[PDB]
Design a binder for this molecule. Sequence first.
Ligand SMILES: *OP(=O)(O)OC[C@H]1O[C@@H](n2cnc3c(N)ncnc32)[C@H](O)[C@@H]1O
Ligand SMILES: [Cl-]
Ligand SMILES: [Cl-]
Ligand code: NA
Length: 600
Amino acid sequence: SQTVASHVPFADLCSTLERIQKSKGRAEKIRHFREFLDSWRKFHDALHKNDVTDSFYPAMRLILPQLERERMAYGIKETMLAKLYIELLNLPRDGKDALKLLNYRTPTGDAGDFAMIAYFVLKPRCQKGSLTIQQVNDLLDSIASNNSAKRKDLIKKSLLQLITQSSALEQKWLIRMIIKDLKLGVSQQTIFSVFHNDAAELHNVTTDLEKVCRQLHDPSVGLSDISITLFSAFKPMLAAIADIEHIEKDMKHQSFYIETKLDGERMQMHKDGDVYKYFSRNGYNYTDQFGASPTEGSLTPFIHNAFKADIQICILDGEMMAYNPNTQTFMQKGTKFDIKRMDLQTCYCVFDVLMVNNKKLGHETLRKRYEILSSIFTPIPGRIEIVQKTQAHTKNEVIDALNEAIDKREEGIMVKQPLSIYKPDKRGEGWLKIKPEYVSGLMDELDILIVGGYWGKGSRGGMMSHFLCAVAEKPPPGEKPSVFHTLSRVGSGCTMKELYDLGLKLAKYWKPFHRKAPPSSILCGTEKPEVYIEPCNSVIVQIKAAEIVPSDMYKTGCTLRFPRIEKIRDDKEWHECMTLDDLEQLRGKASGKLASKHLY
DNA sequence: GCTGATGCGTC
DNA sequence: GTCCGACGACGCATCAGC
DNA sequence: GTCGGAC
Ligand SMILES: *OP(=O)(O)OC[C@H]1O[C@@H](n2cnc3c(N)ncnc32)[C@H](O)[C@@H]1O
Ligand SMILES: [Cl-]
Ligand SMILES: [Cl-]
Ligand code: NA
């Protein structure tokens, strides 16, 4: 009747988490987790003696909070947690503690760590806790439920019970469990391996923490044929970046497939007669949009009769696309629509199948699965299609297909082994992807100017880790530009030393940004920085992006998709920044794509 | 309804 | 060679203040 | 989705 979690204090879990975090090496980290796990299982045998659904799940879901799927979203991140703590603790709204919580990335040695910053605010203001692990999970259920119920007052009540009955140390971990980032220094594969030799593999075919804890409760009992099951979300197979020069060797010198890389959203479909379920890339259920029955949804009523008559059970893997009925073309993922919440029509482009009736297909060759896929339903253009797998054998065909995708303004191509099996959650292992941005020289890059700064968080706390960037207005001959229009934010591509060195150089030039008193040299759209810098003191950065897309957030009216810093252009001066004219040329050069040049 | 904040999934 | 948080974009939903 | 880097 009872549960182990109802007898384990939450402080015992926090003690283990504190020992794992402070532990230096992986051996020490594993040891502390095993002591907690072994003790839990010993207690588990005693309490129950002889059915039982109880398991390590109430503790596992807090150790791996990113894997939580039963509980809905809390609706709370660092900003809301700070506001709630200010209101529940009744902090002076303009005091030092309230401003530190709301501005936890601005340093005042823990800038960028909201939990640690909250801990020091709480240490003198808080009573050692008394809640059990089950009680904590019950209160976390209440917060998620009340967020879904749109009862902010009940969130405050549920959280106030957590604050009152927990020590400052416990609340630091409760905050990390709510944010879903524990910073234990040990990966979820290591946690899984300690729990059971089959936990990782079983999680990849279920995405269900409680099923993993329930089925693999005995570390000696191992499951035999762990596989994809109907109506269970499996982690989809992924694709590694191909080395174009070695593509024939990577395909084992045999024939291979080449298919277009579609710019949609990954989605898997489970079918049993009139019952359908749809799961996203990370396992979230989107049946409400696509349709649980042939009478509801954006997709299911239009595909129900595409299937052959003898198809009772079916598991599909594909890419959800927006189809334009007028132009008979796909609208790429991004602006103006969301395929999971839609005069366009949802089109499901299928490229794999994992089950047909009483037949599991994950261990069949890709060619065999492609053969079965081509016979289990009749395609309906613009509703449900099959991704064509063009056969090829040479490196020169792959380069042609890439240039064809560049010409067609497509994202890229996929290259797959026809003899490979379906390996859930595996990157590569038969699937390769090729984009223009992977080839040196193909991309038209942008030399733009840093104009704004933002404080970092986490491992990049305490420094300006990302930046607001702008382009210049063309000045008369011999003159330098004086007005800049913001284009995009960027915060990746630099090593930590380069970010640190750039931070020391620009340190003495940052000026606090005032939205009611902006600088005249920088014209911002909706997006405002935390600090600005006058252009003459700043630095040019060379930006690689995939394309220029519309934006309501930057003064140029457009921004960059997938931007990153390729080089910090110390060899350029600030006034050598690219102008709005250079941007307009690039934007209309190839419908926004920054790839318009063939590989040779 | 609009705007700006804030959060949540996708990429 | 793998895995992860810190970053980028979006649409949509929700909220408070207007 | 990319990125550098811890592992
Ligand atoms: O960029 P990335 O590594 O996430 O690429 C993988 C994703 O690309 C999408 N996609 C589009 N077309 C295909 C085909 N034919 N096969 C496999 N994946 C494909 C998916 O969304 C995938 O997750
Ligand atoms: Cl083990
Ligand atoms: Cl939904
Ligand atoms: Na780089």
